[PDB]
Design a protein around this ligand. Structure first.
Ligand SMILES: Nc1ncnc2c1ncn2[C@@H]1O[C@H](COP(=O)(O)OP(=O)(O)O)[C@@H](O)[C@H]1O
Lengths: 577, 43, 459, 384, 120, 193, 104
């Protein structure tokens, strides 16, 4: 595009002179050194250009060059095990140049333009290729990385290149129209990737946490929301989920959050295991970092870049798992942008978009069948940390009723050493009804009724606990003390998972089913005893209590035998006394 | 306690309502000032 | 030289100068009148037809005929050095003192260049202040932003001066070269009156804590642009010292409410349409621009730790200033009006205080073993006592139990021996000894949070 | 200009027991008396103008009432200043500017008053400025801004309010002028909030710059309990540099008595909370004793009628005497309550009414009245 | 439009159901507030009553013809406020209202409907 | 124009017990029925219309759903005027401008109603105007003002609402017309906050 | 406000402002005991709190309510003293003992 000169310089706003042809919302690099901005207005022969950087020290008369492309990312091989800023800038290669700071106007490419890969063709000349199909393959350390065709392209192949070693700048296929397809392509972050059709929830997202996966599930297209107080052990929950989920790749997005995830993940999980290969977990992670003193455009593009990269890894055929952190901090950034644009606010100050941009981020998630006859999924678990902690502000009021499951991390439960701390009286999920058939066909046939019976047990234990502490847990009729002791058994040996153990971090579905079965059997036999008139002290002094107390700490190989023996022994030893 | 919470909610709603009127009048004043100074080259 | 005449407008703070497209946005100019007296300025909104200037102090005596504007600097810079370690500056950065102006080694720009989220590390070690509360219950590890939420009448200047005189770092516990880690403090005060200025000067030059401090004073009736520039100069000098000569720095910013009010005033005079509750929309970014220049990096040995002292305006925690400040920083400390009126100094409310990075700075190899457990137990016992005091007032000492009697006496002795300390300098060992003596007043088996291997050697 | 500004170390005696014993002001200081209409932001300033310890007085009225300014021109050349015996109108330079005169003369009058006071300070006396209703200044600025057609900050006040107020409050203080003497300009500027709320820009910007701050309350002014100084919203910052002067010129444990009085008040407040929750009969005996001692204090030591003949100028020794009596009574009553006597008898002890009416005495027979009442208390509270 | 066509021209008996009128009101506030038109009450513009009445009143029963149109607009009170602008305007336009309950839903009753605040 | 304005000394019997015993209204006076939604304002006004003791009745409606107008239209012609014995709709001049119809027609309808009532007073009868949703009228005023692009008052409404309402309500009172014979115009204006 | 100069000794009667102050204090006490009642109950009241309550009610019933009759300063002061006599002596710390003895 033709260049242009500056006219006015007022704060971060710059007005270009001589741009009759520049489009809206384009990255343009204003100044002598490059200060990439964004064209937000057009009036006759000028353009308002919102700059990201300081803007101090510019003069009127310096050139302004346009680009023509609206804020794209570079999707290709090389993104695994990388750290990126909000606009996909590699932080390590930046540190290699500027020292320890972040100077103004650095230019660096996201994908390394100097590494060599092992290309293996998958087509032949004279063949028919359209959007979304496969051209080849190249192994990126850990698993095989495909090379898709840029969507909305087609033609007839004319020439491929023989297998060997080539970089990301050797045109690897050439069509009939003369177009050159390389190993990567760009995709504007504000436009979702297309598919064939969106499927429906019929498969659970097996986390590894018993509470979640049993009582409050979420399909493998879901959208959960997890608030967090200051000192409720949320980081460890998120790390355990990213470690033992059933996803293939994990993407993490943080706009305002610490620079301790870096050290923590990158030095703990590597020296520890990725529990399928033993190598570092950072070989399936695309971590994205943003502190508080970075530009607002960077924060917004951070959220959208995260979700677009996840959509790409889905379109390759995998199953991705996103973890958006501090959607509230994102909303703060958005409100600042708005108040800069001189816009009439709404209740609490947020613009009248907070409900549309949010719903445009949470609606890019769902199981889908890609453009090449495959399967994919993207599941989002976005934290919502209010400034005070009240679920009535606009951010939370919209996130609820946009999301499915909801996981109420609490701090008092953490103070009572109950880890993980998820308040079952406040959480809730909506993916139970439409997921029951998978349960019947893959776990057992009474799994729904066992789950509902356990939920009723907990409900009654709480409703009783309402007034227990008044007169102490000793002056109640035997049925009440039985209910209370059974509730204690439930919430102290089934609803609690020491995430640091060796063989107790991943309770399988069958294992959870067995534990629920044993607890309900013990309750049935204890009520059968009390109904006859045995004391309420032998019940608690039996050895089956300890036997089921050590249930979860056992391994996943001896559990069927342990379960059979435990049920036999309970049913036996609950008649002799 | 719920009566006090209701009172607080009402007062808070009124106080926030009486800021958007101010922002609106300020934006109109800015528009008028721009329209006037766009004609004050000399005279 | 003396160019750029031909101004065409003067009103309040502003001054429109006619054709001048050679001045860079954000520059610094001077305005020589028709009588000799000069002034300051700052270019903004430069365009091809005019260039709005904003004078610093005042504009009484300027006319459209005899007035000229001249350049000084394209940006705002500061001439830093190591010789400025016994001096006393003001605002812009000229000495309000008798000593001669020093010579600089590099003239840094006063802002910009945020740290890199992959070039940091995790703060571990601890700093000792002398105040026993901020030591045994609200520890202050290096590289942390720990604000102090003062009040309207409560003593904030005195606590600030006490911390500045007492606070040192203890390398005796880790194990390293003693004369290897120097310590400095860069006290910077915005909007002080005339009493507080002399109070601060005497409070420093009495003990002699001037030999390692650098003061930036901003007496209240100075212009607002200087009150905007002050924390930038302070933090520039601080992180230069630290990340260039391996110092250990401690920055204290006084009354951030005055900074916020000056910021809102400047915005209004620049026609910004305030964002929310009269304050500008960019105030979160503006605050996070200075609450964030302090940390620890990997590869260096220095550090920068901040203690912004602010004052909740109407005794409120939902005002935008304390809201955003708690949103950006990690911790808080609450002065207590009740303890003030009852006559306790330093008045620190220990229930609503907190320190997020405390568990990373206490333990074997740093201070001691029983640190965190002692803190937990003291918190629990004090809350118990403070509840049963009102209970007693309503019911009577007639229907109590022995444990409640003992908890009441413990709470009273804690308020009268552990908080009330005056002008003492309690080391960490002395504070822990007092804490264990105070905890002894309870029977064992009530210490439901300490380990027996600790109860044995102490108590 | 001056040579250098000294540090204030001597009080500004004004007659009122609250504003002298509890919330003092040094002889270089500043203050602010904000409150809604119907509190006495004018009665208190007139009393400071007719019963102070200064040499000269300048009374600036910036938007006051014509009657409020003519009741000074008529009465002051009849009273006798308490330092020389002459008329009181031989030390007053009052500067009237009422509410229907032109509108820029408001700020004009403020600056005129301050410059006259600084002239007298450079001369060598001890002036005492008194600016009334600085809020009228702010509203004048608001009107001039609305004529300039500019961009206003919160509530219309132009975006240079606080600068003017700070520059005006920062030319007050003890100083050693260019002739090698000493002077002083004390300022007491009233403030009128538009609804009584201390969140107006003027009511907030006038904090953070001042010394004492005497917040007036409306309910105390409905009960006809004057002066209506709220005893827990006010504060003072000078009460720690004046203790040497108190020890030198009043007593030796006067700081300790002041501390005991303040502690008793602002501990009784907490008990009053539970009182309003439950009721003042489910409390113990010591608690009801604390409540009743608090009420005796509140009605016999913090109340003052500016229209009595001798209860309109209470000096330091008289205030210290009353405090001593109250403290001794409380001590002996605590001992007796420990013994077991009943609080109703403790209250019916007529030393109650004695130490109550002990404030309508003159200042000549007090040194004997106080001794007699002190010995009578010490006797009668061990008789029983 | 389709409903009125089928009813008053082919003699059907339609039954229109509009879910989430709250999302409609949000869309309306957002599309309006981009033209600077004096936001009326807590965001939403002044003519929200005019618009809701523009789309509600299209349901009636005409003489001579034998069709009908019947509406059941489901809406969710934003924060259980019955004094929110959306429920207030809707209650002022329509006739009779059926109010779901929240306490009955906790005890496990379905469809949770408290017949105390509802009428036709 | 009239000769002179008398003072009302005769009750306006509406039929309802509260409003004829506790809080009565003289037969020249004014009134107001504010209240939230779903409380009975429409039923109360229609009951006044069908059982009052006025000669004629002029029902104005500006913003009320058309089902009410159809109710009165298809109900009245089979009732009986309880003064003579003819159909009830032979003493009603109801004016209809529902919610979906244009806006400014609201204020046009208010003024047409009051002028018809003034005429029927000038003939020597005693009429009883019953307006409806003066709040809706004020909304129409606000819309027209914001189109004119003038500065608003408290909560959007233009700063002459009070003057307009005062004139409208002050055109109501017992009077002795230019023919010598007396007359009266009651007014019952609903409001809906 | 302009009352302390237009009333007092030599103009209306030498005991006007004192009866004013005392009536204000007593009525404020009665109004506070109203809320005390509304919290506790009328039978759990001290023996003099009931006196203050009944003074407040008599004040609202005889001193304020006056129909359309033309009183006089002396008739109204006689009514005020009648009311103030309903409280005991010695509990009126505002009036002087001389007036206290002369009128009751
Ligand atoms: N120290 C005092 N003693 C007795 N009465 C007072 C005192 N101060 C104020 N008042 C009463 O309070 C009223 C306050 O008057 P004024 O000062 O004009 O109003 P404001 O206090 O609102 O400025 C006066 O009418 C006076 O009767």
């Amino acid at each position: 595009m033709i260049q242009g000169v500056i006219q006015k310089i007022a704060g971060p706003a710059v007005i270009a002179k001589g741009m009759l042809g520049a489009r809206m919302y384009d990255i343009c690099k204003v100044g002598e050194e490059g200060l990439v901005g964004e064209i937000i207005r057009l009036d006759g022969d000028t353009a308002f250009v919102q700059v990201y950087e300081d803007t101090s020290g510019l003069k009127v008369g310096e050139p302004v060059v346009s680009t023509g492309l609206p804020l794209a990312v570079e999707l290709g091989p090389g993104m695994l095990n990388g750290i990126y800023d909000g606009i996909q800038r590699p932080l390590e290669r930046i540190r290699e140049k500027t020292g320890i700071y972040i100077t103004r106007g650095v230019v660096v490419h996201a994908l390394d333009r100097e590494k060599k890969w092992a290309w293996t063709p998958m087509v032949k000349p004279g063949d028919e290729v359209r959007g979304g199909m496969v051209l080849g393959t190249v192994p990126e350390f850990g698993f095989t990385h495909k090379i898709l065709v840029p969507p909305d392209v087609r033609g007839r192949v004319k020439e491929v290149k023989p297998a060997g070693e080539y970089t990301v700048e050797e045109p690897v296929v050439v069509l009939e129209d003369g177009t050159e397809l390389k190993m990567y392509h760009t995709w504007p972050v504000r436009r979702a990737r297309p598919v064939q059709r969106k499927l429906d929830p019929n498969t659970p997202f097996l986390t590894g946490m018993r509470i979640l996966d049993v009582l409050f599930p979420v399909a493998m297209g879901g959208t959960a929301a997890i608030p967090g107080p200051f000192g409720s052990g949320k980081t460890v929950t998120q790390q355990s989920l990213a470690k033992w989920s059933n996803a293939d790749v994990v993407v993490y997005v943080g706009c305002g959050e610490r620079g301790n995830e870096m050290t923590d993940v990158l030095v703990e999980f590597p020296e520890l295991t990725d529990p399928k290969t033993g190598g570092p977990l950072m070989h399936r992670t695309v971590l994205i970092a943003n502190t508080s003193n970075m530009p607002v455009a960077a924060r917004e593009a951070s959220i959208y870049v995260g979700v677009t990269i996840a959509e790409y890894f889905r379109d390759q055929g995998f199953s991705v798992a996103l973890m958006a952190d501090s959607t509230s901090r994102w909303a703060e950034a958005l409100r600042e942008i708005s108040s800069r644009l001189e816009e009439m606010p709404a209740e609490e100050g947020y613009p009248p978009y907070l409900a549309a941009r949010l719903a445009a981020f949470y609606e890019r998630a769902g199981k889908v069948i890609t453009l090449g006859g495959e399967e994919g999924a993207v599941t989002i678990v976005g934290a919502v940390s209010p400034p005070g902690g009240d679920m009535s502000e606009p951010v939370t009021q919209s996130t609820l009723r946009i999301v499915g499951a909801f996981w109420r991390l609490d701090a008092s439960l953490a103070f009572r050493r109950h880890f993980p701390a998820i308040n079952w009286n406040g959480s809730y999920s909506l993916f139970t009804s439409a997921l029951d058939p998978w349960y019947r066909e893959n776990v057992a046939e009474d799994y729904p009724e066992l789950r509902d019976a356990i939920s009723e047990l907990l409900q009654r234990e709480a409703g009783l606990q309402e007034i227990v502490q008044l007169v102490g847990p000793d002056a109640l009729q035997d049925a009440e003390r039985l209910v209370i002791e059974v509730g204690r058994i439930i919430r102290e040996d089934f609803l609690q998972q020491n995430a640091y153990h060796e063989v107790d971090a991943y309770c399988s579905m069958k294992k959870a089913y067995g534990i629920m079965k044993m607890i309900l059997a013990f309750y049935k036999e204890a009520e059968a005893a009390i109904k006859r008139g045995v004391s309420i002290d032998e019940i608690l002094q039996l050895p089956v209590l300890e036997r089921i107390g050590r249930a979860r700490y056992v391994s996943e190989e001896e559990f069927p035998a342990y379960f059979e023996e435990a049920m036999k022994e309970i049913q036996g030893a609950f008649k002799a006394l | 306690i719920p009566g006090i919470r209701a009172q607080i909610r009402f007062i808070q709603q009124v106080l926030e309502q009486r800021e958007r009127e101010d922002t609106f009048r300020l934006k109109r004043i800015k528009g008028k000032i721009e329209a006037r100074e766009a004609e004050e080259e000399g005279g | 030289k003396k160019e750029y005449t031909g101004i065409t407008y003067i009103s309040g703070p502003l001054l429109f100068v006619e054709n001048a497209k050679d001045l860079a946005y954000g520059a610094i100019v001077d305005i020589k009148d028709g009588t000799g007296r000069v002034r300051g300025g700052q270019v903004i909104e430069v365009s091809e037809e005019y260039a709005v200037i904003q004078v610093f102090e005042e504009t009484t005596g300027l006319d459209l005929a005899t007035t000229s504007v001249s350049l000084v600097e394209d940006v705002a810079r500061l001439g830093v050095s190591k010789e400025m370690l016994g001096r006393r500056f003001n605002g812009i950065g000229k000495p309000i003192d008798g000593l001669p102006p020093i010579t600089p080694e590099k003239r840094l720009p006063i802002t910009g260049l945020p740290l890199n989220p992959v070039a940091r590390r995790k703060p571990e070690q601890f700093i000792q202040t002398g105040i026993s509360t901020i030591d045994v219950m609200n520890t202050l590890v290096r590289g942390q932003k720990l604000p102090i939420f003062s009040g309207s009448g409560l003593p904030a200047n005195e606590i600030a001066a006490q911390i500045a005189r007492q606070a040192t770092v203890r390398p005796d516990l880790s194990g390293e070269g003693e004369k290897e880690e120097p310590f400095a403090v860069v006290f910077a005060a915005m909007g002080i009156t005339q009493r507080e200025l002399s109070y601060f000067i005497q409070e420093f030059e009495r003990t002699g804590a001037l030999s390692r401090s650098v003061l930036f004073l901003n007496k209240a009736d100075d212009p607002t642009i200087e009150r905007i520039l002050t924390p930038r100069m302070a933090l520039t000098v601080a992180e230069y010292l630290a990340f260039e000569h391996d110092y250990h720095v401690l920055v204290i910013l006084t009354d951030m409410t005055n900074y916020c009010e000056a910021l809102r005033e400047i915005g209004a005079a620049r026609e910004e349409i305030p964002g929310r509750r009269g304050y500008p929309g960019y105030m979160y970014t503006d605050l996070a621009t200075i609450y964030e220049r302090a940390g620890v990096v990997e590869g260096k040995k220095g550090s920068v730790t901040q203690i912004p002292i602010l004052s909740m305006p109407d005794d409120d925690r939902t005002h935008p200033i304390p809201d955003l400040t708690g949103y950006i920083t990690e911790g808080q400390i609450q002065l207590s009006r009740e303890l003030h009126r009852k006559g306790i100094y330093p008045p620190i409310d220990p229930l609503p205080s907190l320190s997020r990075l405390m568990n990373n700075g206490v333990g074997k190899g740093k201070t001691r073993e029983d640190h965190k457990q002692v803190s937990d137990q003291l918190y629990s016992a004090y809350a118990n006592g403070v509840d049963i005091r009102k209970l007693v007032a309503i019911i009577g000492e007639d229907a109590l139990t022995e444990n409640d009697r003992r908890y009441l006496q413990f709470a009273d002795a804690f308020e009268r021996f552990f908080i009330n300390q005056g002008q003492q300098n309690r080391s960490i060992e002395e504070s822990l000894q007092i804490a264990w003596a105070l905890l002894s007043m309870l029977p064992q088996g009530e210490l439901k949070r300490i380990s027996k291997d600790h109860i044995g050697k102490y108590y």
